[PDB]
Structure formats: C-alpha cells, structure tokens
C-alpha cells in the first residue's frame, strides 16, 4: 500500500440552496447576487466545487470561468437530488479508468468488495449505535441483541454468495438499525421527530426525521461524485448498485462503509443540537419538507464535520473527512491495479 | 504643631504595599506615570475628573451619586479625594475605580484597596454618614466588587494610620522590600534602588533581572549657528534659513541644547518649559553658559544632606579621595586596552603603569584635599603625555596631542581643541542628569564653585573623563571622524568645521547609549543610564543608606 500522499486542497465547495441566486463572475470574483442584490461572493481561488439545489441561476461566463477553472458544478434538485454534473472532457488517464471496466466486468472482486462495503457499513452503523443511541435508563448503551444482530448481517454480508442477497442483508440491516434509529435522536424521538424507518426508502418524505436522511445521503452521493471524479475514477459503473438515472451507480457503492459516519452521525447532532424541530420543516408538499433557514444551518453544518480530522488505519495519520475520501480512493486504483491484494477498509 | 498635616488617602494604600515605597510617596512629590498609572489617569480623567452632584448637607430621601469630593477629617488625621459615592438618603457607599480585571484573590480585592474603602467610609462616617461597606468598580470590566467594613479592616486602617505618622516624623526611611515581586510593579526600584541598596547595604543579594530604563527620549542638538526653532504643535520644526531642516517630536525630546547664535520662537519656549524639559544654552564652543528651572527641583532632604555633608570636609575629603582614584584606575584601563604600537611598544609600560597609580596610594594616603589635588593633576598630567600616542597609532597628520596645551581655554592643538570640546559639553550631562535627582552640582565637596562649571558636575566627572570624553576623542581620530582637515584655525586656537562638529557630536551621542556592565552590579548598562544610577546613590550615601560608594571602576 503506502498511499503516502493525501490530497491537501486549496479550496472548499460553494453552496446555493436559495432558488433565486444570481452568481457573478467578476474576474476573480464569483460574486453571488440575489434579485439584483448581492448576498455574498467568492474569489475563484478558494472555491473547490459548486452545487445548484434545484433552480439556482448562473452565467455561462461564470460557467466559462468555472470550466476555465475546472470546478465541478452539480445542477441538483432542491432536495439535493443529484441531477446534473460536469466533467472537463473526462479524465485524461484511461489506464486508471480501464482498471475498473475490467474489474467491473469481473464479478468476483465486486462480491469481494460489495461485501466489504455493507460489512463496512454494518461495522460502523453499529459503532454509531454505541455512539448515538440516546439511552437514559437501563438504556445508556445499545442492546447487544441489536448489536449482535448487526454482527449477523455483518457475517451474512461477508458471506454473500451473490450480489443480490447482499442487498437483502443491507435492507434488514437498514430495517433493523433504522428501526432503532428512532432512539438515535434526543433520548429517542422527542418533538414530533418519530423515526418512521418505514418511510425510509420512500421517494417523498412523510416524516421529520425521515425528511432529513434522504438529503444528506442525496448530498452524500453528491460529494462522492467529485470525490471520485478526483483520482481518475468514474462513479457510474456500480458493482452491484445498478446505474439509475441520477444515481451515480458506484458512488452509491462506496458510501456503505461511511453511510453511518457521515449521515447517521450528522442527523444525530442537529437533532441532538436542537436544529431539528418538527416545526423547522415544510411539513407537506412532499408529505414532509424543510426550510432554508435550517437548511442553511445544515449545509454549512454538513460541511464542518466533513472537515473533522481522524486517522487512517494504515498509518494513523489524521486527515479530514474530505481529505480521507481520496486516501481510501487511491487504495482502489492500486487494488484496481492489484497493487494491494487486500482492501483496507477503515471500518469504525 | 505643624509638624505633620492630614494624610491623603491615596497615600495610605501604598503603606501596606511597601514601607520604603510609602515614606517616599507621602512625605513629598516627584511622581511619574507607569503602565498602571497612565491607565491610572486615562480611565479617571474621562469619568472621575469631571465632578457631579454635591453631597447634600441636609439628607432625607434622595440618591447620593456624588463624584470628586474632597473630605478632610481633622480628628482621624487624613484627607481624601473620593472617586465616587453610591448612597440612598443617608447610607453612603465609598466607590473607588480600579484598573485591572477581578484579581485572582479571595474577594477580588487586594489589601490596600480594602483599607481604601474602609477609611473612606470612616471619613464618610466622620461627616455623619453610614457606610458599613464599600465597593470596587473595575472599569475595565465594570465588575463592581463590593467590600464591607470589617472591624479589623478599620483596625488595620487605624494601625496603618498610626505607623505612617511614626515613620514620616522619624525621617529614617525603611529598608527595601526583601526581593519582593512588588518591586516590578511598584515602579520605584530605579529610585528605590532596593537590591542596589540591598546588595550595597551588605544585605548581599544576587541580581535577578532589574526593572530597567524606558519612557525617555534622546536630547536635541542644535549646533547650527543660524537655526530658527518654532512650534508645529507637539512638533518642533527646526528651520534654518526659513526652511524646515528637521522636526523635533516634543513627546520624545529629552534635552535641549543651543550652540552659538541659534534662535527659537517664544511660544516654542512656552512649550518646552511646560514639560520640565531642560534648555541648556551653551556658547558656540560648548562652554555651559546657562540653564533653566521651573520654580526649582523641589526635593530638599537630599539638598540638606548634601550641604550638611558638603559643610563636612571629611565627606568632602573621603568622597574626593574615591573620585580621582576611580578616575586614574580607568585611565590605566583606558591606556592599556586601547594600547597601540608596532613592536616592543604594543604594551603599556610597567614604568608608565608604575607611577600613574602610584598616585592612587598617595591619593589614598592624601591627608587632605589639596595634596589630593596635586596627586590628581600630576596623574592627569602623566596621563596626558601618554595620551597622544593612542590616536591613529601615533598622531595623524596634524592630529597631534599635547599634554601641556591641556587644561586651558584657547585650544592651540587640534586634538587639544578636541579634548576641549569633549569635556566642555559633557559636564552638562552631570549638570543636567544630577539635577533631576534633586542634588546641587555647584556645592562641591571636592571642587570649588565658580562660574560656568558646577562644583560637583566637576566632582563626578572625575571618573568619567577617560571612559567617555577621552575615548571618543581617540576613536573619532582613530576611525577617521576627526582629522586635520576637520580643523580650522582662529584667533583663540584650534577649531573644527560644521561637518565634523556634527560628526563628533553624533558619535558623542552614540557613546551615550552604549551598553557596558556595572562592575559591582554586573548588568548591561548604557552610558545614558550610568550617570543617573550614580546620582541616585549619592543622595543615599549622603543620606547614609549605603555605607560606602560604588566607584564604578572598570
């Protein structure tokens, strides 16, 4: 292994949740304007990525410059539903991307790794339970009956014989864990935030707590796009997550290891930080929706934890969550070059 | 009788901080401004300088929030100037502002401040008011820290009331605080000279790092004989021939000198006097001709000490015997370390070093001042014949020194012009800095008062001719500051051009700040701070605090 180099990063992404932005290239200034009134601006130097939640306006001159500075704009839906993206005439390496065509056209390493993803998902869905189970009496720690059950989809995932059984391993592991996610939040669902983990998976949300996961993950996928558009990878060739339109099929595959760390822990802070009040929501128009006032809280919020520093298991060198994204990605193309026989996982 | 008046309350807090501190403050004056005391005013003069409501003589029902009120109870023995009072009807609260945060001490108030509110309450109680407690308002945090007049705080107050009177009447000033960390914050150590004195008073201490010079500027030179000086506010614009040649920032101008017919505007003079800034007129050549005072340097105890000790020939004789021997010792130290020949002469002769300091033992065994006098002049003389050789490795073109054109008015050797000036301007430095310590340079134990040269500015200049005035001549010759082309002739004797006159002055200005070490006290010391440390102990030795004098023999 020895993925010696971590990606440092000069800039950080820009966000537009307001449906009436107006974002200006003023030479170096990526000014934003709002109904002919500026709200903020960005020098183009410190900007890493651009996203447009639903109808967010822009000038091609800025596109011209944004492409001129080769900064990935993601046209998104309002709930962060990933719907548009741009890449600068693709990645110049074929040998890297050809690693995966042959590897994806190969099924074994898919099962060898699709396993290692929800195995890496359950291994740290569970650790978040010990971390984010809001228990107060005879309850301060997660139930070993639940914990060992996660150790069971753990082994059932790790002994997936096909790439569709592995799916069922996750859903019950989702069904079960999210059955228990209802205690993940403020001593268990308090102010109207009852975790109906059955409205989990529903295209539109009924529930307060079931209207938040579906965007962070809808966001989760979004960064993986650029986070995988970095090392030369292409996030459309899902090993087991069959490409859906809008679903970057392989960007969907690799978030299983960190599905819990990044959305199951941020939801359990904003709630547990009183950011999630069922009254902070657009309670309908999807059965349940939310407001920019708190949205602007979470989008910056979702950004900050993303800059928390933790170690990577192989060298213990602490690297922020964005910066640890590319490290685990290099392990791929080298495992995709076969350089590392095993695949280190950073299950937590 | 009128032997002791009412004590200001600002003088009682200092009593429990340090006694050597307090006796110096209360009994009289000479105060300056520090970190805490510049802040001491800046917070104050915006709020506490401006007065407020008068304290009602008939108090029934109304808020008492008076400010800047002067109390004086003739029975307790004290006078106050209250910061503020918070009172309802007739129960008043002493209110005093402070400077820092809440101190990390129990109650958030140090002891002197605790005494402050209580006696102030005792004074408020005196005029028929109920205080029973005070407060501390830290305008930095405005954290009102109340205090209640606990009886022993009255007890210390009265105890502090009584000891200060006993000490001040006695007139014997208490010893320094024993290596106290109050010294760094007291802002007296340079005038306290505590472990200066402590180590000097055989309470042999080992120097920590001292509380050392800041807050002063460098003097102003006007050697241009056609300069016209005028005010630009706190700027002092040096225009010569009606054009701004230089500007002098009054805030950092320490001394004023005038050589030859140099002019200054009247309102400028109006300014300089305001900041106790000396204006030392000198003729065009460095004869210290006159000076200025502002109703005098007010200290008297040192004055009476000096006269009483100057009225004493023994102090006149004992002190004078240390002067020239400290002078002659530095002469040999100067001759030897600067000694510059070619071969078999690159060392000072023992024969030369036989007799220079054979004068010391004779000066040590001088039975009186007059025999002490001849020993010096002979030693000074034998110094001079050997002086010529140490400039430019032998006299440069025309830069030839003469021992016997020395000590006389019209210098008819160029370097004897150079030696004439160096002494001429430098005696002022004693005359100026020794003035600040409240002493008298014309009342000489050793020398005699006569016009133009102060009898003690001469006395203390004895040791320091070789180190300062004699050395700068050599270097100015040696490095090339002064050569023959730097000299022009005249009716009187040898003289210098304007350009070199800058050159010797500024380098002379540079000799003044050069760091050396005190032989007794072993610390980096500049020359602008050699003399003033020296002036201070004289008062103390004239006061008798230090059993003897540190001659500063280097």
């Amino acid at each position: 292994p020895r993925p010696i180099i971590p990606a440092d990063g000069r800039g950080l992404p820009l966000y537009v949740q307001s449906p009436k932005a107006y974002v200006r290239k003023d030479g170096d200034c990526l000014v934003i304007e709002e109904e002919r009134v500026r709200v903020a601006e960005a020098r183009l130097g410190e900007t890493s990525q651009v996203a447009l939640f639903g109808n967010a306006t822009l000038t091609t001159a800025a596109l011209h410059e944004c492409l001129r500075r080769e900064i990935p704009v993601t046209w998104l839906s309002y709930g962060g539903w990933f719907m548009g993206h741009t890449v600068s005439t693709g990645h110049r390496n074929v040998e890297t991307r050809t690693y995966q065509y042959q590897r994806s056209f190969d099924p074994e390493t898919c099962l060898n790794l699709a396993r290692r993803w929800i195995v890496a998902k359950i291994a740290n869905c569970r650790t978040l339970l010990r971390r984010n189970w809001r228990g107060e009496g005879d309850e301060a720690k997660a139930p070993p009956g639940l914990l060992m059950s996660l150790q069971d989809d753990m082994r059932h995932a790790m002994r997936a014989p096909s790439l569709e059984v592995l799916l069922g391993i996750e859903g019950a592991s989702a069904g079960r864990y999210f059955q228990h996610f209802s205690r993940m939040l403020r001593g268990g669902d308090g102010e109207g935030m009852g975790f109906d983990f059955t409205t989990r998976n529903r295209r539109p949300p009924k529930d307060p707590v079931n209207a938040l996961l579906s965007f962070a993950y809808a966001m989760l996928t979004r960064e993986w796009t650029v986070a995988l558009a970095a090392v030369g990878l292409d996030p459309y060739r899902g090993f087991y997550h069959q490409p859906r339109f809008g679903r970057p099929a392989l960007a969907l595959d690799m978030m299983e290891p960190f599905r819990p760390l990044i959305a199951d822990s941020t939801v359990l802070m904003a709630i547990n930080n009183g950011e999630i009040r069922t009254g902070d929501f657009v309670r309908s128009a999807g059965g349940c929706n939310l407001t920019d006032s708190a949205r602007k809280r979470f989008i910056a919020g979702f950004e900050r934890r993303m800059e928390q520093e933790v170690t990577h298991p192989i060298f213990k060198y602490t690297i922020s969550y964005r910066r640890l994204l590319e490290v685990q990605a290099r392990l791929l193309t080298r495992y995709l070059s076969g350089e590392i026989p095993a695949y280190p996982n950073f299950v937590t | 009788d009128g032997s002791i008046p009412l004590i200001p309350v600002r003088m009682l807090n200092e009593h429990v901080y340090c006694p050597r501190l307090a006796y110096l403050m209360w009994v009289q004056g000479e105060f300056s401004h520090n970190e805490f005391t510049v802040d001491g005013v800046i917070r104050h003069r915006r709020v506490d300088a401006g007065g407020g409501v008068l304290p009602s003589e008939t108090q029934e029902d109304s808020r008492i929030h008076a400010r800047s009120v002067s109390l004086s109870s003739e029975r307790l023995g004290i006078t106050a100037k209250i910061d503020l009072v918070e009172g309802e009807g007739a129960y008043v609260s002493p209110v005093d502002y402070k400077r820092g945060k809440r101190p990390h001490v129990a109650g958030g108030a140090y002891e002197p401040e605790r005494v402050q509110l209580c006696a102030q309450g005792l004074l408020l109680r005196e005029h028929g008011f109920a205080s029973d407690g005070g407060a501390l308002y830290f305008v930095a945090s405005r954290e009102r820290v109340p205090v209640a007049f606990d009886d022993e705080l009255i007890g210390r107050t009265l105890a502090a009331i009584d000891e200060m009177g006993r000490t001040a009447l006695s007139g014997t000033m208490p010893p320094p605080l024993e290596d106290s960390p109050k010294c760094p914050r007291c802002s007296l150590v340079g005038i306290c000279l505590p472990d200066e004195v402590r180590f000097l008073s055989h309470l042999s201490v080992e120097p920590r790092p001292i509380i050392p010079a800041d807050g002063r500027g460098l003097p102003l030179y006007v050697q241009s004989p056609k300069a016209y000086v005028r005010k630009d506010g706190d700027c002092l614009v040096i225009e010569e021939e009606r054009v701004r040649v230089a500007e002098a920032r009054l805030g950092e101008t320490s001394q004023v000198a005038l050589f030859g017919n140099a002019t200054l505007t009247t309102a400028a003079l109006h300014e300089c006097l305001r900041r106790e800034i000396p204006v030392t007129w000198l003729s065009y050549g460095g004869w210290f001709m006159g000076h200025t005072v502002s109703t005098g340097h007010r200290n008297v105890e040192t004055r009476t000490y000096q006269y009483q000790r100057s009225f004493d020939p023994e102090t006149c004789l004992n002190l004078a015997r240390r002067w020239i021997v400290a002078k002659i010792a530095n002469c040999r130290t100067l001759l030897r370390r600067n000694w510059r020949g070619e071969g078999d002469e690159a060392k000072a002769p023992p024969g030369l070093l036989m007799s220079l300091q054979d004068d010391m033992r004779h000066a040590m065994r001088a039975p009186s001042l007059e025999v002490l006098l001849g020993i010096e002049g002979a030693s000074a003389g034998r110094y001079f014949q050997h002086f010529s050789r140490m400039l430019r490795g032998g006299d440069g073109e025309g830069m030839g020194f003469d021992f016997t054109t020395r000590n006389r008015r019209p210098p008819k050797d160029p370097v004897n012009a150079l030696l004439s000036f160096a002494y001429a301007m430098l005696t002022r430095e004693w005359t100026v800095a020794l003035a600040a310590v409240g002493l008298d340079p014309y009342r000489g134990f050793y020398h005699q008062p006569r016009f133009g040269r102060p009898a003690l500015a001469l006395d203390m200049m004895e040791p320091f001719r070789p180190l300062i005035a004699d050395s700068t001549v050599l270097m100015a010759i040696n490095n090339g500051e002064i050569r023959t082309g730097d000299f022009v002739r005249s009716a009187g004797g040898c003289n210098l051009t304007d350009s070199a006159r800058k050159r010797f002055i500024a380098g002379f200005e540079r000799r003044m700040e050069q760091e050396v070490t005190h032989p007794i006290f072993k610390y980096t010391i500049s020359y602008r701070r050699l003399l003033e440390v020296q002036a201070r102990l004289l008062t103390r030795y004239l006061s008798g605090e230090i059993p003897a004098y540190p001659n500063f023999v280097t």
């Binding site: 932005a21 030479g27 709200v39 903020a40 020098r43 410190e46 950004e303 | -």
Partner: protein
Amino acid sequence: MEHLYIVSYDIRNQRRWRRLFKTMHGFGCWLQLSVFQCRLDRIRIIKMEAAINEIVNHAEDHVLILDLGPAENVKPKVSSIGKTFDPILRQAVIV
C-alpha cells in the same frame, strides 16, 4: 494556515485603479477608502504583485502592502476607529 492582509491603494491612474479594483476587489474586500482587506496565504499573494505590478506603474501609484498575521488571531491588531474591521473567513457561501 493562512494570512490576512490589507491594502492601501493610493493609485495614480483610474485604469490602474480598475484593474486594481477589478483584480483588487478581485483580491481584497473593499475595506476603507484607499483600502481593501485581504486574505491571502502562501500562494495567491504572489499573484497580487504579479497582477499588481502591471496594475501599477511603480513610479506614481503608491500603495503600502499590508501583510498581516496568520489570520486566526488578528482582532487584537485592529482598531478600526469608526466602521469596525472584519475579516472574511473560510466559509462556504451557502446561498
């Protein structure tokens, strides 16, 4: 690991002002009259005097470069007598 900076633009050509302003508003936030506040680390600083050495002739335009500390503890070093000074920090523009 950054630095904040300021600029003191006393420029002696309007064209140079614009390309200053253009690049300088492109560089620093308009802070005071002749002043922007600037936030620049190792890198782009070099791109000012890159930009501002053509942006100016060095004869007549005069600016002091106001190169400041690591931008995390700069509030001690400010006294903006009227309108208060304020850095713009490492945040993602959210709207």
